[PDB]
């Protein structure tokens, strides 16, 4: 009992490591694949189930399925399998030796929290644990006490206004739009270009393509016009088979779905509009502080130029008499994990944990009362 | 607030169509609680309060504490984060600001109207709260007509039917000669 482990069950990726380290010791995607063919060879009885980078490597003969969908778990067996894998094969640390820290998106069903707490306390018999929010850990990592969080993850995008020493639970907005919808739209448009991708392996391929050759556009109409003069914007990517794919307008089209949800058919508003509404719902005095500080985190906000576009949109919407500043740290991908580690390292938090005596006594209805 | 809590239960509703659906759900399966803590405790023994509703798609939603939670926001505005007081407190303050003699008459007569006051038991809760706040030496009566939804329209029709009101109207000639400001002085 010297340190604690912080695990972030990201909608598309899993981050884990020791409390105190500045970088995670285990970064693998949440994939639980199973064989799709029959199997003929006899010198192999291997691992009916596959997880982790192994699944990514041999994805061509597996039906990859994401255990977590838009922030809510759908298959508990897959999540338990990934937890076991991360705890034993990668970390090689017994659950009893150290406690575990878990994080989840806001406005999630209580059933998920109760089931997760019960499984953690019963199966792995962890000495203690806790449940927190990714946005607050982002604040802790950023070393600030006031601001607005843009936690645009792979599965969920949400904002949580905060003030010195207190939060505003009544001004929390959660949007289902996230990286998965962007990937689906990218596949749909790549179909309109002439390239077809259906199965999950090509889903990973398109995910990599978006990660490598996508960016946001300051002006949509101007970019479209310059695309009409398509002689300096098209770029080529090399597929594993060697085929070359040329991508033009699709580079700056899919990211615009964040600001224009109507493309996918969702009757909602963009991230700028949602943040403006959330800040407006707050008290007048704290609006200045919230404008002066705007923290963003998540893997969906690494597109170059996103900060500039958000600043321009907010200034256009907001009155043109004050200053709006956007802060874009270059390590926002692991901000949640860093915040969790710092929070665990805090001396005052050594008593806020939830122990097993606790659970020995009642169904995990205790996760909520406390530990929140 | 009902949408927000329905999210905490496990059911999500965002767009306006589901807004209408939740509005209907509240209209059909909501009521006020005489005692909040006692109702919460009885909800802890959730075996006689939960009710089911049929969605258009056929899905069934089970609603428990949310039935008597959202209406309590009227008496506890702090739930939404508004730094104000409940309807009982506002009515008490309004009546107190009046002259002493007319306080008795105001207490003896309390008319309520609108579509937000049809929740069963609201009148009893309001009576209990007012009597607790007001001195316990007189009688407080709550009148809850069963047609308060259209009370405003009925009153307007009766006022129009009044013979004396046939001359209080505002006609085009006087409006044009005077201007839009005339309505401001017309009965405030």
């Amino acid at each position: 009992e010297t340190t604690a482990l912080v695990c972030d069950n990201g909608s598309g990726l899993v981050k884990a490591g020791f409390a105190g380290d500045d970088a995670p010791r285990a970064v693998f995607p949440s994939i639980v694949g199973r064989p799709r063919h029959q199997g003929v060879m006899v010198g192999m009885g291997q691992k009916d189930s596959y997880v982790g980078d192994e699944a990514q490597s041999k994805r061509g003969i597996l039906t990859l399925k994401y255990p977590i969908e838009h922030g809510i778990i759908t298959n508990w067996d897959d999540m338990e399998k990934i937890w076991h894998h991360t705890f034993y094969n990668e970390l090689r640390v017994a659950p009893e030796e150290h406690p575990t820290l878990l994080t989840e998106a806001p406005l999630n069903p209580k059933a998920n929290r109760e089931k997760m707490t019960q499984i953690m306390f019963e199966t792995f018999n962890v000495p203690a644990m806790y449940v927190a929010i990714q946005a607050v850990l982002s604040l802790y990592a950023s070393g600030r006490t006031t601001g607005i969080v843009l936690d645009s993850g792979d599965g969920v995008t949400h904002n949580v206004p905060i003030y010195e020493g207190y939060a505003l639970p009544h001004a929390i907005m959660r949007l289902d739009l996230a990286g998965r919808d962007l990937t689906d739209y990218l596949m749909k448009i790549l179909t309109e270009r002439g390239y077809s991708f259906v199965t999950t392996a090509e889903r990973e391929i398109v995910r990599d393509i978006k990660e490598k050759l996508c960016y946001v556009a300051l002006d949509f109409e101007n970019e479209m016009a310059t695309a009409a003069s398509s002689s300096s914007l098209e770029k080529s990517y090399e597929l594993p088979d060697g085929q070359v794919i040329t991508i033009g307008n699709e580079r700056f089209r899919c990211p615009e779905t964040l600001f224009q949800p109507s493309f996918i058919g969702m009757e909602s508003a963009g991230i700028h509009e949602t943040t403006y509404n959330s800040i407006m719902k707050c008290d007048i005095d704290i609006r200045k502080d919230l404008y002066a500080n705007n923290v963003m985190s998540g893997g969906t906000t690494m597109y170059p130029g996103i900060a500039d576009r958000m600043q321009k949109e907010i200034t256009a919407l907001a009155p043109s008499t004050m200053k709006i500043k956007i802060i874009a740290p270059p390590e926002r991908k692991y901000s949640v994990w860093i915040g969790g580690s710092i929070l665990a390292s805090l001396s005052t938090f050594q008593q806020m944990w939830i122990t097993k005596q606790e659970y020995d006594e009642a169904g995990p209805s205790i996760v909520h009362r406390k530990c929140f | 607030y009902l949408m927000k809590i329905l999210t905490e239960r496990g059911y999500s509703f965002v767009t306006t169509a589901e807004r209408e659906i939740v509005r209907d759900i509240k209209e059909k399966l909501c009521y006020v609680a005489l005692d909040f803590e006692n109702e919460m405790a009885t909800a802890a023994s959730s075996s006689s309060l939960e009710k089911s509703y049929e969605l258009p798609d056929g899905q069934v939603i089970t609603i428990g504490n949310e039935r008597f939670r959202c209406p309590e926001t009227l008496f506890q505005p702090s739930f939404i984060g508004m730094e104000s007081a409940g309807i009982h407190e506002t009515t008490y303050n309004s009546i107190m600001k009046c002259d002493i003699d007319i306080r008795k008459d105001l207490y003896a007569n309390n008319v309520m109207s609108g579509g937000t006051t049809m929740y069963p038991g609201i009148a009893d809760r309001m009576q209990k709260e007012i009597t607790a706040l007001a001195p316990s030496t007189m009688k407080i009566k709550i009148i809850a007509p069963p047609e308060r939804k259209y009370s405003v329209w009925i009153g307007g029709s009766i006022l129009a039917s009044l013979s004396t009101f046939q001359q209080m109207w505002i006609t085009k000639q006087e409006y044009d000669e005077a201007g839009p400001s005339i309505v401001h002085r017309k009965c405030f």
């Binding site: 838009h70 922030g71 | 496990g10 059911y11 999500s12 509703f13 939603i61």
Partner: peptide, 7 residues
Amino acid sequence: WXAXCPA
């Protein structure tokens, strides 16, 4: 989810 969205 159960109602609205899949999960």
